[PDB]
Amino acid sequence: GSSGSSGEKFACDYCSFTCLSKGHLKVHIERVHKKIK
Ligand SMILES: [Zn+2]
Structure with a gap:
């Protein structure tokens, strides 16, 4: 089987x-692609 899906x-x-x-997903976007202000 594959390593991801x-x-x-x-x-x-x-x-x-x-x-x-x-x-x-919200925490990923809010810290990696956006930031807290
Ligand atoms: Zn991402």
Whole structure:
């Protein structure tokens, strides 16, 4: 089997990142592609 998959997971709009939680996607965008101010 493959080392990664799309499955039923959420994906980043800016890079090749994926996660099972929408909260983890929000935290990824808010810290990696945007910042807290
Ligand atoms: Zn990303």
